[model samples]
Target: SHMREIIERVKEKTTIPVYERTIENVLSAIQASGDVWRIVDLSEEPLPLVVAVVTALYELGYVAFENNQVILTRKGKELVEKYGIGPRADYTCSHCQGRTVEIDAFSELLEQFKEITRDRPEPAHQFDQAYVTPETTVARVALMHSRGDLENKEVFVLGDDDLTSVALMLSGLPKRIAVLDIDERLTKFIEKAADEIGYENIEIFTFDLRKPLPDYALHKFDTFITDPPETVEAIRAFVGRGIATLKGPGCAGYFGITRRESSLDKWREIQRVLLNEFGVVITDIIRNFNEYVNWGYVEETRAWRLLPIKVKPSYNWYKSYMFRIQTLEGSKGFEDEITVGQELYDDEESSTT
Candidate 1:
């Protein structure tokens, strides 16, 4: 049978519109190790999708479940053999997990950071929020530290669910740390933590990004950090305002884009707008630099509703590549006066919304 035909059947059976090629890749992973856990660990795709695809394969009589093993049926074996499909290779650097950023040096910081956030509160999904691992937050700071973006530079963080605001202070750098987030509980959490850390240079404020930035705070910063809600409009609302707050040339902004919810088409559009629409140059994109933990409250999330099965992910399966961009012709503050309403949290590819 044609792979497209097979995939269409799988989609119909599951009613989950996963990428066609990805289903094939899942089959190859199954062929590699019939073990369900092993397959999940070996695959780069998100966990819930993997489970949904496996369930569909079983329903199609292509695979059988024996305890934890996912044994491909004779039919599935023939399909894989005929297509020349094989196990997916593991090529990432074992040490960095392909981050290429030296994270071992941040081990102490990670431990301390983890201790501080061990009791971190649950995400308020109303804001489409899911928190990242502390290791991710420290690694983010490490990236900033290497870029010379934190030392003596006033840093602006548009969102702080990763609590990057507090992580920045722990690094003991940055001239000034100003964080803006809409959630008062979250902002207060960071503010209280910073106060506990006895950091005098940092400030945390609660403000919705949809509104205009305070006058004195605009165009007065050298750098910004944001994990925008993965929609084109959300990008403009977050990154645009981030850039607008920049002081001038050479100023940089760090943000993230995910392949999970955002398609390559979305990435291309984002790059185009950042380069052509916003006066910025793409400096670097670090893969898997941010890992998102699904909230206990995710059952109501749009991503969860689409799943054919609800096996809690064995690990943090959602991630994003962190983008580092530099300004050239000054800060391009496009969203300062625009009306980006509720749609700012959603897009065709949007999952967590």
Candidate 2:
């Protein structure tokens, strides 16, 4: 999402000077243009979003009240880009901090695992549980079946008897598909009761994946799909095994808490650990799932890398290009621009003022 969307989302929460960072963001954008009026004319956004940003700037005392026009103060220009103010600098909810540490550690292993899995697409048993995000899963399925070999390949899944695996099974892709679960009793119950309740194509496994399984389980197939149990500690254990089991860059999406409201203050400390481990650039986020309660997937490869690494000011030409526009489109003429501008907003001052 863009900065405006983030600001709007922030506004939806509390209104207590939340956009202090954002107002400065616009100030930099304004100063870069060398003409504030030029920005209003060229920008595609409604005046309100801009005005809201300006008001925010004024409230934050980042703008100078000079000559009846708003001009940015020095501090406003230097730190305008870093505007996301979700949490405090020192806060660290226990759950959030733990998840951050766990995921960060897991990422180091995942990075190595992904590199290996991608190199081998053969009978290497590359898989993760079926709980990955829809976009990520779609991309993965597209890549894997783009070759149209799913029916011939062997796919193994360990986790919930969810749509992720069922869809794969019904497609008749894998020559052999095995679904594993921790509850042997539930496995038996599902074997006997699932079809009666209308659940079909579910091959269940009655084994505890947490403990050591037979040595034969290692690198046992061309792909292995597992979500594994969720918990900062549980994920830590699962990640090592998950990486060990992958064929190479074979798809594995882990579910874990990335950020939490309670841990807002400790995000920086958390980020240092997470980015280092996962090599993950968060692509998408969703609420409530398994042990995570909230989760996001690492946007991978070329798509992931293209995401912005640092914040910067908005520029009309740059935004237009990113929006894929040829040029700014509108009526042009000094007299008409003034007459129309006044008619559009009666209280606004003229350019000459």
Candidate 3:
């Protein structure tokens, strides 16, 4: 059956919990949209996963597609009427209305990204900073814009060694962009670039996530984006502070999480913080969305011996999955008080020296 095969294959191909969650959302979306036989665009789904589901549906005689519009077969409609969740669904694609953004959108920003972030300093790697390539940085900005998180939105970035601040401003869509970072170099670098480009809407501030958010930065933004340290405490603090900056319900936030460094336990814990504590629900997760450039940096550390291979490859191995979460009705936002500590920003084994 398409139902069983699709679920099994999707689960087999992806990490636990995320795969299952994607399946639930798809079925719910199909049923929730009213006419079970109507075409729908679920392109916000991980492309691979979406293809698998759609292909399975077609193969199992449960759905058909014309011009990439999905329409259910009689069997599919019967299945839904028999087991569908409800009449109206709240499931809406966040990235696009009629169509999702193309992968080519990343290519659109290549020239500008190189021109803007040119002469940027190398990663200090002290605060767990690893900068993505110029292409990846602009792709991120483009993704945010397509998701409706950037159009005339008040945006805040936490710990931006990626210089995504400048990239977002170059989009000319966001109403305002503010970057808060612990590194003085990055803040000044972004400020200088913003001026050079004559984009006055970009603002930079020196900030430490371990402390409470500054009063001036709180509860005002429409969206927040961050690439924080992968540690549990650091992730929580950064996310907590990110939430503190949001205005409330319906506001969205984006962040990158990695399976290479964070375990399933940590994933579950972070999801709990987003949902139960912060009053937000995850809407989309795109895997391997951002690829870092200098995987060779890891070779210089003593911990390199722990690797199965002795040498780093030319290809970038470190990649992160993008996550989008939106505020829910009961969202109280991030209000916990956390103390400032060195461990919050540094791992004991970090090669910061």
Candidate 4:
């Protein structure tokens, strides 16, 4: 009945002939990607889906190319509607200034980030260490600034390898900025910079995040940011501290994660904790937002084999997606003691090794 009904609808609505196979392929691809409702550019789509959709247009005339763009004709629309094709929406964010404005914003802050982190410490490789480019750090700050997250907000960084603490302080936006790291070199670097630049609002402390924060450090921040280790335990620990530092509802948080190391399964688990456990709504997941040049240091290791490297090595291949989560009204409060494994920092899954 379903197949007969689909064919009948196609014949009634379309002036052109229907190629059953081609239409089915296009529909299948859309369903596979779970993006049926959203408008997407087929040129950038998977090749198989592109081939199938184009074949249908050429053979059946269900779709047309208007001004070098693909559009659904009456027949195509009916067919899509009849089959209950996905109804997804395109991703749009104003804070990041579109899907890929990180590069443009990064360029604007290059000089400043270079000067600020000129004498900064090197990566210790102690805690999933990979350094984001100065441009990436600047772009991150700019994006947060655009969203009013830094305007008179008390911002905290759980880890400071990227030297975003310095960037935020340099912006002259936040009322206060703090960095908590186990590496004393990073703490001293930020402290020295604060003193030299005379930015007294920046505070640097050497503290292991695995333990509970001091009373002075509890529930006092308006926003928190981190690029934590890619493990379920590490994400929970880092974000747990972040949530603990917040001053309750309407507070904001930012962090970077990658799909390469932390697969979709990890993403689902992390989102579950953030949304269900922590009572925060994920606002954005800006893809390829942080470009890491130092990632090449791991190319000789087993982890590099997991990457999709073809003809040549791509230096900018290890980009990260920036996630913005904001606490809603009546959000679940943070816990004082976050339980982690005995090998919290040394666990293989905790690092990109």
| Best candidate (score: lDDT) | 1
Could you give candidate 4's per-residue lDDT for residues 3-99 as a string of tens digits? 4544455445433333454355455444333222111121122222233344434347565655433456777667777767643344557565343
TM-score list, all predictions: 0.85, 0.33, 0.67, 0.67
Runs in model 1 lying further than 4 Å from the true structure: 7-23, 29-71, 336-342
Worst 10 residues of 2 by lDDT: 318-327
Candidate closer to the true structure by lDDT (higher is better), 1 or 3: 1
Question: Which candidate should be chosen as best, given TM-score against the real structure?
Answer: 1
**Candidate 1 TM-score over all chains jointly:** 0.85
Predicted structure 4: clash tally: 5
User: Which residue pairs collide in model 3, if any?
Assistant: none
Runs of candidate 2 exceeding 4 Å displacement:
1-151, 161-163, 184-203, 229-232, 246-353
Poorest 10 consecutive residues of model 3 by lDDT?
A: 34-43
Q: Could you give the candidate ranking by lDDT, starting with the highest?
A: 1, 3, 4, 2
Q: Which should have the higher TM-score, number 2 or number 4?
A: 4
**lDDT, model 3, position 181:** 88
* Candidate 3: tens digits of C-alpha lDDT, residues 194-239: 8888998877889777777877788999999998766667767887
